[PDB]
Amino acid sequence: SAMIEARQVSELSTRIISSVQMLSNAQNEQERKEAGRVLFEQLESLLTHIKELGGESFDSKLLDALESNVQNVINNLAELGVTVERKLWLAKEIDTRVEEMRLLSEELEQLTRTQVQNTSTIAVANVTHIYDLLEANKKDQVYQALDALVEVDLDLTERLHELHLLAFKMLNQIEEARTLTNVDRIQQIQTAFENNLKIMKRRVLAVEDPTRSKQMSQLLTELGKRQVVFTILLQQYENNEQSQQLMQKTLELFSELNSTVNKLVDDSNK
């Protein structure tokens, strides 16, 4: 009757594994609740059988090595079931935190575009003015106007294009961040975002324009704060790594469990 349970165990062992894999590749807090809930029942069975088979022998050394193999297998499915739990949370967090950052970065991109825009209009307004000065033959004020056109407008038009270019890059980064799975890229974008943010923070402070500099410095310090989204972007990866090692562990444990349920199916042959 020990062979009756042994095979019964070897049989349920396989269905368990295919239930953990299933648990692993679960997506919402439903496919998780399921692939796991059945993982549960399948386990309570591996136990009833592992228990009965636990009577067909009384070898101290083996009965303990069995009690042990079953716990390890249980803690594993446990730690793994928690990982798939933590995964769903990280995804929820990241997707949330990113979008927050996007709305900000997008505001900043538009706020810098808006300024590039204004500089043009004003340059045109500024040139129109020169036509008047020129008419009235106020030749000095003309020279002075042309000076400003260069020392101020043409110079600002460039500084702002440059600034808007960064805000644009900084946005593109936040857009790629939400679906970043590759660890090296997460590494790269993180420090790139950190460096960009820094020069950006400095370029704005120098721009002589009250309300606008504050607006931007604010947006920047705010984005700077949600910068941690990158750390948690790593944990995502770090955790999926775990989730995979655990799975590979499950196999060694089930192998070890049976390599013992077998040594046990004997002794009842003595």
């Binding site: 460039e158 500084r159 440059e162 400095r202 370029r203 120098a206």
Partner: peptide, 10 residues
């Protein structure tokens, strides 16, 4: 670069 020198100038 302009923006780099500008920074120093400041």
């Amino acid at each position: 670069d302009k923006e780099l020198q500008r920074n120093l100038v400041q």
